[PDB]
Write a protein that binds this ligand. Structure first.
Ligand SMILES: Cc1ncc(COP(=O)(O)O)c(CNc2co[nH]c2=O)c1O
Ligand SMILES: Cc1ncc(COP(=O)(O)O)c(CNc2co[nH]c2=O)c1O
Lengths: 414, 414
């Protein structure tokens, strides 16, 4: 109970506005999160006081910028409990990190007969890179089936992963079902079969503590914009032994050692995988966001979101004609559908009430077809959301149902 | 004479500080530029008022964020005089744009016997991607020789580019020599031989007007951090007909149309080449930087930098034992070396005087070996730099020479 939601909301200026005459109710944090004053003012101080190119150590502003950038790297390492800063690569997001794994590891380690194993609930960022990799290498793509409640059975994992499996790619938390996957046990299974494991942690990292040494994940991808950090920056973590043997996905300055006319040698880790001028301000702001979240406490955020999710599930079960997808035990989000109402109209009406939710396929079309739906609505929570906002959401959903029912009965009257 | 340098400097808060007790003299804009209040406050307003994920059009903040992002795209299109927004791809920088060209165009259009033609003055971002592409395709890499003053002869271009040349990759302006290359004539030559042309415009775009239709460049890469914009964002321009036939370099959400279990289809341009959540705030800030530069006028900035460069060249010629590299007609930078003093010590002493210059190889090792030097110093100018700062630079260089000469004569005395 260490968490004061009023004091937390006071740090996010964007929450204190009205939309369509109604107080803003932002329930779309799984799409992107909002930023506290700490992060915005960190970007401000960088651009106002010590912006310069990094990795030169020549003048004072350059030294300060380099110190900020590499200190943010160390902050990330501590945040996910990685062994070394050499295992922390700054990218532009989760998607780019997964693409780097698929390019530099998969396409170099896949032979005909090899298997890449994913799940039906994966977002598109954790699907199409593997599709392209197996198409380029002539390998085989396989899918772990899902249970009736949208969870993954460990026996299904043991059945799908075989001696020919080299890569198992799975999300830590589903951005649609809210499912928390058994990443540690799946990693043990993949290693038992001689495969590596690649964890999509875009949805888990902002909301729960990450320990890559306890997870024993071989790769782990995360996105800054979902965890109160700036846009356009993310992290690829990989075990140092694996990253040492992988060739770079991008080539250019800053990642080189010697450059001949036709041949070149690369820098050591992690700079081998960071070509060109890096995302300096964004990485420093991600470090600031990590400081913010850690001072609040990721366990506290997790418990707050558990309370929010249980409350939301109970209040959704109080609504007639509403279908919620996923398991009971879940992260802080609810994907649903109103009977007789397309989710786009639901979210339009909700925005008219000032409530921001997402409508569509949520970048998971195979999962949508597994759910036998064309689209869904989704309300997602974070550390600044309250139970009163969920009350507003469910009241607006009831009003939406009533409104569309009575629009139906008047046009039938005609 | 429309340019008031005092009013311009008033917009950059980072310039108004002291380093080591001396007023800051920032002459390292070729490494990275500083930002005006317009850009920083644009980022501030985004994160404070309408941050949300884009390309959904579902709630109001999302619509505002999408409008800002795509409006920044249109601003870029107008800025470089591209025909269509479909030809404007947001990347994380020039290096990534050139790597995308090398991955999606070069590696798909190079056969054994084909030629990729570059120059000795290219930065590493415009060298190593082509090295890797020709190594992957078994093609051949060739270099256009340079004149005695660091310029490129059009006859040397016609000699190097042949009927087997498919790609000519060249920088618009050298970040070391200050040379402005004849990009339009080289494009005509490359097209005459059946090749496309890829322009590295990282150093030209911030300081001179770009017209890709007059240049007739097939690809053009630029970086936001060098043109008063945020870090971690850049642009790849490509002719629409070429981009339509190129496969994506990255795969994931937002760039897809249909996603099956094993096959996928891509979005139309430009979103085909933008996977995952884009660099929303950075792109909007780049649009703000474009607004700033265009209200000042790129021709005015170019003339101011021409005045600065002529003044700096004359004052450098007044110094004994100083070697300047490159031609007389040049962009706004001076790369040089002090006799008997390593450039790292030069730049250390200069930072002790509050002057920020760069020392090293400037990501151009083949050029350094062509210059028969191991490292150089470089002072680069932008719209906020004055002639008084160049006076401070040359006075500090004279003081540095005297200091090292008399440190030499006292240790010889011993
Ligand atoms: C589980 C998961 N993986 C990967 C990604 C992609 O991350 P990015 O590269 O930073 O974009 C997302 C973002 N998912 C969503 C973005 O918008 N709505 C969403 O549900 C995600 O939720
Ligand atoms: C001509 C040229 N091309 C490409 C690049 C790479 O751009 P980036 O991807 O945004 O990093 C640079 C940056 N050149 C320099 C960066 O620092 N010092 C420099 O001289 C450049 O000057």
């Amino acid at each position: 109970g260490h968490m004061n939601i009023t004091d937390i909301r006071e740090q996010f200026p964007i929450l204190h506005q009205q939309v369509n005459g109604h107080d803003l109710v932002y329930l779309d944090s799984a799409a992107t999160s909002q930023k506290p004053r700490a992060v915005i003012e960190t970007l401000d101080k960088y651009y106002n006081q010590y912006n310069s190119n990094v990795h030169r150590g020549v003048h004072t502003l350059g030294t300060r910028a380099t110190d900020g950038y590499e200190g943010a790297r160390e902050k990330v390492r501590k945040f996910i409990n990685a062994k070394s800063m050499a295992e922390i690569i700054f990218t532009k997001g989760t998607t780019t990190s997964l693409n780097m794994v698929a390019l530099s590891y998969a396409r170099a380690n896949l032979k005909p007969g090899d298997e890449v194993v994913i799940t039906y609930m994966e977002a598109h960022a954790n699907i199409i890179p593997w599709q392209q990799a197996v198409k380029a290498t002539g390998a085989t793509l396989k899918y772990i089936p899902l249970q009736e409640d949208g969870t993954i059975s460990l026996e299904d994992v043991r059945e799908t992963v075989t001696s020919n499996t080299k890569i198992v790619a799975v999300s830590h938390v589903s951005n649609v079902l809210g499912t928390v996957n058994p990443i540690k046990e799946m990693a043990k299974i993949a290693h038992d079969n001689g495969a590596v494991i690649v964890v999509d942690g875009a949805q888990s990292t902002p909301h729960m503590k990450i320990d890559v040494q306890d997870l024993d994940c071989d790769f782990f991808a995360l996105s800054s914009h979902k965890m109160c950090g700036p846009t356009g920056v993310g992290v690829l973590y990989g075990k140092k032994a694996l990253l040492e043997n992988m060739e770079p996905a991008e080539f250019g300055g800053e990642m080189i050692d010697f450059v001949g006319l036709y041949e070149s040698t690369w820098k050591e880790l992690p700079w081998k995988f960071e070509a060109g001028t890096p995302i300096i301000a964004g990485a420093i702001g991600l470090g600031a966001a990590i400081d913010f979240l850690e001072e609040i406490g990721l366990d506290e955020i997790s418990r707050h979101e558990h309370k929010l999710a249980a409350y939301a599930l109970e209040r959704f079960r109080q609504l007639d004609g509403v279908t919620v997808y996923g398991p009971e035990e879940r992260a802080g989000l609810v994907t649903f559908n109103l009977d007789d109402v397309h989710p786009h109209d639901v979210a339009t009406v909700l925005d008219a009430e000032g409530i921001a939710v997402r409508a569509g396929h949520h970048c998971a079309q195979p999962l949508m077809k597994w759910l036998d739906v064309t689209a869904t609505a989704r309300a997602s929570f974070y550390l600044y959301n309250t139970e009163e906002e969920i009350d507003k959401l469910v009241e607006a959903l009831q009003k939406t149902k009533e409104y569309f029912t009575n629009v139906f009965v008047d046009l039938e009257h005609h």
